[PDB]
Amino acid sequence: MDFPQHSQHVLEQLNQQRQLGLLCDCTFVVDGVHFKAHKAVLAACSEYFKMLFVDQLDISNAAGLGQVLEFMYTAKLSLSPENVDDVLAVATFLQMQDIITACHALKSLA
Amino acid sequence: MDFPQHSQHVLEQLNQQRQLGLLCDCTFVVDGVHFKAHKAVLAACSEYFKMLFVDQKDVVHLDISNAAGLGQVLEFMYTAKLSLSPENVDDVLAVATFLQMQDIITACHALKSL
């Protein structure tokens, strides 16, 4: 009845599509850096993107956005004392409480 | 820093998008029933839809007659859940065979083997 690795397999397939520019329907440029992704995945991970794509503003931190986008497509998030403020700034804008909380733990305990 | 429930949470959000009409860029009718889904998810789960949307090949026309079986297969793509009975297994296997989804095909043969 249940396939325990299905959701991982779907996300891995979405990551591959994204790495090859396939079926990506939104792009944006932050500090000259070009990003491309799926509207549906962005809306799945960020309440900001959900409002933007269901209804109808930009950050300045390309390094933070890349790591947050990498998190959406891989479930991995490599936080460090040097990037946590960047990532926290992007995640606050995108209203992603899962990353926001992970940043607070790193900052408060380092 | 790994998030063990992330992929599951993304898929349930995509399922909620599909249950509503949100961000679904693929729509087709089977036996008078309208279906909506994401091309990205269809291509992720079905080799047939991958050939159409990703490989950009000229594929054969959709060959599905059972809307109930298609609903169950689509539900599986977005939930990983599949309720197979002796009454529906023939319907689901025919849908999964056309869509070239070996995970459902294998689960149909196993139930039939009992």
Q: How was this structure determined?
A: X-ray
C-alpha A36/C-alpha B112 separation (Å) is: 44
Cα–Cα distances (Å) from B26 to A8, A84, A108, B101, in that order, read: 23, 39, 46, 18
Neighbours of A65 (CB within 10 A): 24
SS (H, E, C) B36-47: EECHHHHHHHCH
Cα–Cα distances (Å) from A91 to A52, A65, A77, B59, in that order, read: 15, 8, 12, 41
Asked if B10 and A72 come within 8 Å (Cβ–Cβ), the reply is yes
Count CB pairs under 8 A between chains A and B: 95
Q: Assess B114–A contact: CB distance below 8 Å, yes or no.
A: no
Resolution at which this structure was determined, Å:
2.1
Mutate which of A1, A2, A6, A8 to disrupt the B interface (most B C-beta within 10 Å)? A6
Nearest by CB to residue B7, choosing from A23, A75, A102, is A75
B27 phi/psi in degrees, rounded to 5 = -140, 135
Q: Assess B102–A contact: CB distance below 8 Å, yes or no.
A: no
Domain assignments of chain A as residue spans, ordered by start: 1-110
**In chain A, which residues have their Cβ closer than 8 Å to the Cβ of B7?**
7-8, 10-11, 75
Q: Where are the alpha helices (DSSP H) in chain B?
A: 6-19, 39-45, 47-53, 67-79, 89-99, 102-113
